[PDB]
Amino acid sequence: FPSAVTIKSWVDKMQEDLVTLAKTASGVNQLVDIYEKYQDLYTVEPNNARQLVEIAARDIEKLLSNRSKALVRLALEAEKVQAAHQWREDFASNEVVYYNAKDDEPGSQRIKPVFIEDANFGRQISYQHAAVHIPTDIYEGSTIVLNELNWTSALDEVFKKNREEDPSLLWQVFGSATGLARYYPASPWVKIDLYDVRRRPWYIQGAASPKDMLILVDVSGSVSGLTLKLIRTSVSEMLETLSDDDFVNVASFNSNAQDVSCFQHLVQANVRNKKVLKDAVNNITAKGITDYKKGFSFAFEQLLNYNVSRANCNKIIMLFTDGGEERAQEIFNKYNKDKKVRVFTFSVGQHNYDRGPIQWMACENKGYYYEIPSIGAIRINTQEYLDVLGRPMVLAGDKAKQVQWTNVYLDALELGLVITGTLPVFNITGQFENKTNLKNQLILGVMGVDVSLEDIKRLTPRFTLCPNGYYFAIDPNGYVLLHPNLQPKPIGVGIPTINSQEPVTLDFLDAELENDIKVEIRNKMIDGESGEKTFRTLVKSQDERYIDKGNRTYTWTPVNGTDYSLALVLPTYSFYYIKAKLEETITQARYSETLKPDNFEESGYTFIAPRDYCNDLKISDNNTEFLLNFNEFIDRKTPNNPSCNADLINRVLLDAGFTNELVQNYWSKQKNIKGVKARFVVTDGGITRVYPKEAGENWQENPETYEDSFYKRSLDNDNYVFTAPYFNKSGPGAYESGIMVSKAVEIYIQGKLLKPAVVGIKIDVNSWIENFTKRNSDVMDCVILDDGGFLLMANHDDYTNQIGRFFGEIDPSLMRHLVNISVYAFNKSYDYQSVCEPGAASKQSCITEQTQYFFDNDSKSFSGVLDCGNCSRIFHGEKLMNTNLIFIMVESKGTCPCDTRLLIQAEQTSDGPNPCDMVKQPRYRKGPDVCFDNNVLEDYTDCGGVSG
Numbered sequence: 001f002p003s004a005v006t007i008k009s010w011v012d013k014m015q016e017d018l019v020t021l022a023k024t025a026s027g028v029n030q031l032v033d034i035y036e037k038y039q040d041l042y043t044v045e046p047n048n049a050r051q052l053v054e055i056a057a058r059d060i061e062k063l064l065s066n067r068s069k070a071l072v073r074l075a076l077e078a079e080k081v082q083a084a085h086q087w088r089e090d091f092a093s094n095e096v097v098y099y100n101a102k103d104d105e106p107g108s109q110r111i112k113p114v115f116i117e118d119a120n121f122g123r124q125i126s127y128q129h130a131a132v133h134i135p136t137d138i139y140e141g142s143t144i145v146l147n148e149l150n151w152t153s154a155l156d157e158v159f160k161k162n163r164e165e166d167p168s169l170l171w172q173v174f175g176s177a178t179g180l181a182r183y184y185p186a187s188p189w190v191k192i193d194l195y196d197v198r199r200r201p202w203y204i205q206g207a208a209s210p211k212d213m214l215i216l217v218d219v220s221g222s223v224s225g226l227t228l229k230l231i232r233t234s235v236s237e238m239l240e241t242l243s244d245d246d247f248v249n250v251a252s253f254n255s256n257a258q259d260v261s262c263f264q265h266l267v268q269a270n271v272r273n274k275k276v277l278k279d280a281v282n283n284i285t286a287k288g289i290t291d292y293k294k295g296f297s298f299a300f301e302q303l304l305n306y307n308v309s310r311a312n313c314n315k316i317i318m319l320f321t322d323g324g325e326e327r328a329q330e331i332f333n334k335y336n337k338d339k340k341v342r343v344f345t346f347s348v349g350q351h352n353y354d355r356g357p358i359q360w361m362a363c364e365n366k367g368y369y370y371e372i373p374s375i376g377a378i379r380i381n382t383q384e385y386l387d388v389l390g391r392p393m394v395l396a397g398d399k400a401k402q403v404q405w406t407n408v409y410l411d412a413l414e415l416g417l418v419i420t421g422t423l424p425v426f427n428i429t430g431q432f433e434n435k436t437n438l439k440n441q442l443i444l445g446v447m448g449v450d451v452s453l454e455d456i457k458r459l460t461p462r463f464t465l466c467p468n469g470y471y472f473a474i475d476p477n478g479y480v481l482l483h484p485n486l487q488p489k490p491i492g493v494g495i496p497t498i499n500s501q502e503p504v505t506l507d508f509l510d511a512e513l514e515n516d517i518k519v520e521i522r523n524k525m526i527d528g529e530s531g532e533k534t535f536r537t538l539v540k541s542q543d544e545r546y547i548d549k550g551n552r553t554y555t556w557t558p559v560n561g562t563d564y565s566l567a568l569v570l571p572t573y574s575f576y577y578i579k580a581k582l583e584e585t586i587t588q589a590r591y592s593e594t595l596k597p598d599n600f601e602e603s604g605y606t607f608i609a610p611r612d613y614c615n616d617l618k619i620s621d622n623n624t625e626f627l628l629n630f631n632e633f634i635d636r637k638t639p640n641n642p643s644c645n646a647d648l649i650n651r652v653l654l655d656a657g658f659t660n661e662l663v664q665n666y667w668s669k670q671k672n673i674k675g676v677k678a679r680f681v682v683t684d685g686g687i688t689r690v691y692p693k694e695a696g697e698n699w700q701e702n703p704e705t706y707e708d709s710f711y712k713r714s715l716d717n718d719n720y721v722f723t724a725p726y727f728n729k730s731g732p733g734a735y736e737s738g739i740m741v742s743k744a745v746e747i748y749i750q751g752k753l754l755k756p757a758v759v760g761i762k763i764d765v766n767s768w769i770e771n772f773t774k775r776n777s778d779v780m781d782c783v784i785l786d787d788g789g790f791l792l793m794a795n796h797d798d799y800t801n802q803i804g805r806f807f808g809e810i811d812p813s814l815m816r817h818l819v820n821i822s823v824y825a826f827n828k829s830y831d832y833q834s835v836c837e838p839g840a841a842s843k844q845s846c847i848t849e850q851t852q853y854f855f856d857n858d859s860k861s862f863s864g865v866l867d868c869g870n871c872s873r874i875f876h877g878e879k880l881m882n883t884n885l886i887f888i889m890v891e892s893k894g895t896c897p898c899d900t901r902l903l904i905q906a907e908q909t910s911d912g913p914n915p916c917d918m919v920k921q922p923r924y925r926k927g928p929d930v931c932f933d934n935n936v937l938e939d940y941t942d943c944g945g946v947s948g
C-alpha cells in the first residue's frame with residue numbers, strides 16, 4: 001500500500017489536468033465575458049418573491065371566482081325551472097328530445113350532433129346542446145327519468161351563456177338525484193360502464209357535510225355463508241363514499257365487540273387508511289353469539305373519544321346485520337337520549353329472521369333502514385344515506401349554498417388532473433305557499449364546474465425564474481393542488497398482486513424531501529398565514545439519483561376567496577432575472593438566422609424549448625419539427641405581433657446571438673481537443689447548441705432546459721458536475737457518447753449574481769483512461785466515484801464495462817463501510833406516484849422507496865482499514881476539489897474471499913410507511929368550519945321500515 005502524499009499528488013494531477021480541459025474545451029470563462037461585452041443588449045430586473053406570490057394568488061382567486069359566478073347562475077336557474085315544472089305521467093303524446101351520451105324509442109326523441117373537433121378538450125364536442133348520461137341499470141323512459149329530462153332542459157340555455165361569457169370554461173355538469181348527469185358541451189361517453197354520478201367525489205362532498213361514520217358489522221354465526229360475502233362487499237362499497245374530510249372506523253361484534261384493524265379509533269379515511277380497513281374487512285370470519293348491547297356500547301364509546309382528530313360533525317352508525325329479536329333500547333337511552341347520533345341499519349342477504357328490531361333502531365334514532373338482498377342491491381343502497389344527511393343542509397337555506405372545491409382527481413371524460421366546484425340544488429316547489437316540507441327536504445342534485453390544473457399553471461408563469469424555482473399550492477389538508485412532482489397518475493397504496501375513482505391526494509411532505517423547517521412551513525400555510533423563510537435544504541435532482549444542498553426562500557400567501565395557500569420557492573442567485581431589451585429588425589434577424597436548421601454545420605446541432613411562444617405555434621415532441629415551425633413564424637409574421645408574447649421570443653433570439661458567438665469565436669477555432677465527444681451549451685432561453693452536428697444524436701436530454709437534470713444540478717454547485725451515464729441500454733452510447741461534465745456560468749453586471757447558461761463537455765472513456773493509467777492488475781483496484789456513489793471508470797477493465805453503475809452493486813463490502821466512515825450520507829423517501837411490474841399470488845401503481853447518496857462533510861482525505869472477517873483491507877479515499885468526484889485506492893476483491901449482500905441504489909417496491917403508527921401522530925390539518933346537522937325542523941318520520 002502506497003503513502004498518502006503520493007496519492008494526494010496522484011489525485012492532484014486528476015484535478016488540474018481534468019478541470020483545465022473542462023475549463024478550456026467548453027469556454028466557461030469565455031461565455032461570461034460574452035455576456036459582459038453586450039451588457040447593454042439586455043437588462044437585469046428584480047424577481048420580487050413577495051410581489052409575485054400575491055399577484056399569482058390574486059389571479060387564482062379571480063379564476064376560482066369566475067367559476068363561482070357560473071355555479072350560482074346554474075343553481076338559481078335550476079331551482080326556478082324545477083318549481084314551474086308540472087309532474088305529468090304521459091310521455092307518448094309529448095316526447096322528450098335530448099342527446100344520450102352513450103349511443104351510436106317512443107316517448108323520447110334523440111338528437112344527432114355535429115361533433116366538431118375543438119381544443120382545450122381532447123375529444124369531439126358540440127357547443128349546441130348538453131349531453132345526458134344515464135346509468136346502465138337506470139331505465140330511461142321511466143316516469144321519474146323522463147320527468148327529469150324536461151325541467152333539465154332550460155339548463156342548456158344557462159350552460160351556453162356561461163360558456164359565451166367565459167370561453168375557457170370546461171365541463172359544466174348537473175348531477176341529478178335520479179341518477180342522470182347532464183353536462184355541457186355534449187361529448188360522447190367514454191367494457192361495462194359502471195359510472196354513477198351519485199357516487200362521484202364531487203357529488204358526495206356537496207350532498208352532505210363531513211361525517212364521522214362508524215361501521216358495525218355482525219360477524220356472529222347466523223351471518224356465515226352468502227350473507228357474509230354480501231356484508232364484506234357492502235362495507236367495502238360504503239368506504240368508497242368517504243373522502244379525506246370524513247373519519248371512519250370498522251368494528252365487529254360476535255358476543256364481544258372488537259375492532260377489525262390496527263386502528264382502535266377514528267382515522268382520517270384517506271386512501272391509505274381506507275385500504276387497511278378494506279383489507280381487514282375481507283378477513284373476518286362468522287362465528288359466535290349475536291349480542292347487540294355489547295356491539296352498540298362499543299360504537300357509542302368510539303364516537304365519544306375527543307382525544308384524537310375528528311370531524312366534529314355528523315355522527316352516524318351503520319349496523320350490518322341480518323336480523324334478530326333484540327331492540328337494545330337500554331343502550332340507546334343511555335348513550336343518546338338527545339338523539340345526537342344517527343343510526344342506519346342494513347339487513348343483508350335472504351333469510352327468515354325478524355327485521356322488526358332492526359327497523360326500530362333506525363326510526364327512534366334519526367336514521368334510515370335499508371335492505372340488501374343480493375350483490376346488485378349493494379351499490380344503490382350504500383349511497384342513499386346521503387339523502388338523510390342532507391336534510392339539515394336543506395333547512396339551512398341560503399346559508400348552505402357555499403362553493404366547495406374537491407381534491408385533485410382524474411376526469412371521467414379524460415382531460416387530465418382537474419378540480420371541480422360544487423353547489424347543491426334544492427327542491428323549492430310550493431315555497432311561495434310555505435307548506436310542502438314533504439320531498440323538499442331532499443336535494444335535486446349537485447352543480448359542478450371543472451377547473452383543470454393546466455389553467456392554474458398558466459396563472460403562475462415560470463420562465464422568468466430559474467430552473468430551480470417553482471410555485472406550489474396546498475389544501476387545508478397538506479395535499480398539493482399544484483406541484484412539479486404531482487403527476488397525472490393515481491397514487492399507490494401497496495404492492496400490486498394478481499391471483500378516476502380515487503382522488504390524486506399527494507401530501508406536500510410526500511411531494512419533496514421532508515425537513516423539520518418544511519413541516520412548520522406547511523403548518524403555517526394550512527393556518528392561512530403569510531411569511532417568508534430562507535434556509536438550507538436538501539433538494540433532489542430531476543433524476544432520482546442525486547441529492548443537492550442549496551439555499552431556498554419559501555414565500556407564501558393565502559388565497560383570499562378560497563382555502564388554498566400559494567407559495568413560491570425562489571432560490572438564491574435567482575432573485576434577479578435577465579429581461580431581453582432589443583428593438584431592431586436586422587440585429588434581431590442576425591439572431592434569427594442562427595437557428596436555421598440548414599446552417600447547423602458551422603453552428604452546431606441547435607435545439608429549441610417547446611414553450612408557448614405564441615398561441616398559434618403548436619408544440620410537438622419532435623424538436624426537429626418544432627424548430628422547423630418556429631423558424632417559419634418569426635419571418636412570415638412580424639415581431640411586432642400583438643398576437644403573442646414579447647419577452648419569450650426576444651429572450652430566445654437574444655440567447656442565439658450570445659450562444660452562437662461562442663460556437664463561432666471559440667468552439668470553431670478548434671475541432672479536436674484530446675478527447676471531447678461533444679461541446680454543449682444550455683441556457684435559460686431554451687436553446688442547446690451541441691457543436692459537433694454528428695454528436696447531436698447522442699444528446700438524449702429534454703429540449704426544455706427547465707427540465708434538464710444536469711442543468712439544475714450544476715446550478716446549485718459552484719464547481720463542476722460530472723453526470724454519470726445510465727446502465728443496461730437505458731440510453732444510446734456508454735463510451736459512444738461520453739461523460740457529461742457540467743459547469744454553470746456566473747456574471748456580475750451591477751454587483752449582481754446571475755447564472756444564465758450552463759456549459760460543459762462530454763469527455764470520452766477511452767481518452768480518460770490513458771491519463772488515469774499514468775493498470776488491469778489483480779492486486780489493487782483504483783476507481784473514481786462521483787457524488788452519489790456511481791462508477792465512472794476503474795482499473796480492472798471489468799468494472800469499466802459497467803460504468804455509470806452504483807458502487808454498491810459491484811463492490812458491496814467497501815460501499816457499506818464507506819457509509820459507516822461518514823463520507824456518503826443517504827436519505828430514503830417514498831414515491832407514491834410510481835408504476836411497477838405486477839407480482840404473483842399489466843403494470844399497476846405502487847410505492848417504491850428511493851435512495852440517494854451525497855457527501856457528508858467537507859473532509860478532503862479519507863483512509864482506513866476494511867475488516868471483512870479474517871481479512872485486513874486498507875484504502876485511501878481522496879476527494880477531487882473543484883469537482884464532485886472522489887478517488888479511492890483499495891486492494892483487489894480477490895485478496896479476501898468475502899462477499900456480503902449487495903447494496904442497491906434504485907427504486908424498490910415497498911408498502912411503507914406503516915399506517916398503523918401514522919395515525920397515532922398524524923400530520924396537522926384544518927377541517928371545514930361549517931357543519932350542518934341536528935336541525936329541529938327535520939322530519940324524522942321517513943325510515944325505510946316505518947311504512948313497510
Ligand SMILES: *[C@@H]1O[C@H](CO)[C@@H](O[C@@H]2O[C@H](CO)[C@@H](O[C@@H]3O[C@H](CO)[C@@H](O[C@@H]4O[C@H](CO)[C@@H](O)[C@H](O)[C@H]4NC(C)=O)[C@H](O)[C@H]3NC(C)=O)[C@H](O)[C@H]2NC(C)=O)[C@H](O)[C@H]1NC(C)=O
Pocket residue numbers: 087088089427428429430436437438439440444
Ligand atoms: C320536488 O318536490 C315536489 C313536491 O314537493 C315533487 O312533486 C311531487 O311529485 C309526486 C310524484 O313523485 C306527486 O305525486 C302525485 O301523487 C301520487 C303520489 O305518488 C301519484 O300517484 C301514484 O303514486 C304511486 C306512489 O305510491 C306511484 O307509484 C304511481 O306511479 C302514482 N301514479 C298512479 C298510480 O297513477 C301521482 O301520480 C303523483 N302525480 C300527480 C298526481 O300528478 C306529487 O303530487 C308532487 N307534488 C307537487 C306539489 O307537485 C317533485 O317530484 C320533486 N322533484 C323531484 C325532482 O323529485
Ligand SMILES: *[C@@H]1O[C@H](CO)[C@@H](O[C@@H]2O[C@H](CO)[C@@H](O[C@@H]3O[C@H](CO)[C@@H](O)[C@H](O)[C@H]3NC(C)=O)[C@H](O)[C@H]2NC(C)=O)[C@H](O)[C@H]1NC(C)=O
Pocket residue numbers: 081094095096150151152153154
Ligand atoms: C316538458 O313538457 C313539454 C315538452 O316539450 C313542454 O311543454 C310544451 O312546451 C312548448 C314549448 O314552449 C309549448 O309551446 C309553446 O308554449 C309557449 C308557452 O306557453 C307558448 O308560446 C305557446 O303555448 C306554445 N307555442 C305555440 C303553440 O306556438 C307547449 O305549449 C308546452 N305544452 C305543455 C302541455 O306544457 C315543457 O316546456 C317541457 N319542459 C321544459 C322545462 O321545457
Ligand SMILES: *[C@@H]1O[C@H](CO)[C@@H](O[C@@H]2O[C@H](CO)[C@@H](O)[C@H](O)[C@H]2NC(C)=O)[C@H](O)[C@H]1NC(C)=O
Pocket residue numbers: 053054055057058557558559560
Ligand atoms: C387577502 O385579504 C387580506 C385582507 O382582507 C389582504 O390583506 C391586505 O394586506 C395589505 C398589505 O399591506 C394591506 O395594505 C391591506 O390593508 C390588507 N387588506 C385589508 C382589507 O386590510 C391580503 O392582501 C389579501 N391577499 C392577497 C393575495 O391580496
Ligand SMILES: *[C@@H]1O[C@H](CO)[C@@H](O[C@@H]2O[C@H](CO)[C@@H](O)[C@H](O)[C@H]2NC(C)=O)[C@H](O)[C@H]1NC(C)=O
Pocket residue numbers: 307
Ligand atoms: C383521553 O382518553 C381518556 C380515556 O379515553 C380520558 O380519560 C382519562 O384517562 C387518563 C388515563 O387513563 C386519565 O387521565 C384518567 O383516567 C381519565 N380522565 C382524565 C380527566 O384524564 C381522557 O380524559 C382523554 N383526554 C386526555 C387529555 O387524556
Ligand SMILES: *[C@@H]1O[C@H](CO)[C@@H](O[C@@H]2O[C@H](CO)[C@@H](O)[C@H](O)[C@H]2NC(C)=O)[C@H](O)[C@H]1NC(C)=O
Pocket residue numbers: 514515516538825826827
Ligand atoms: C438527510 O441526511 C442527513 C445526513 O445523513 C440526516 O440528518 C442528520 O440526522 C442526524 C440524526 O439525528 C443528525 O444527528 C444530524 O445532525 C443530521 N444532519 C443535519 C441536520 O445536517 C437525515 O437522514 C436527513 N436530513 C433531513 C431529512 O433533514
Ligand SMILES: *[C@@H]1O[C@H](CO)[C@@H](O)[C@H](O)[C@H]1NC(C)=O
Pocket residue numbers: 059062063066165166
Ligand atoms: C375570468 O378571470 C380572468 C382573470 O381575472 C379575467 O379574464 C376575468 O376576470 C374573468 N373573465 C370573464 C369574467 O369573462
Ligand SMILES: *[C@@H]1O[C@H](CO)[C@@H](O)[C@H](O)[C@H]1NC(C)=O
Pocket residue numbers: 728729
Ligand atoms: C440488464 O439486466 C441486469 C440488471 O442489472 C443486468 O445484470 C444484465 O446483465 C442486463 N442484461 C442485458 C441483456 O443488458
Ligand SMILES: [Ca+2]
Pocket residue numbers: 220221222223289290323324
Ligand atoms: Ca345471529
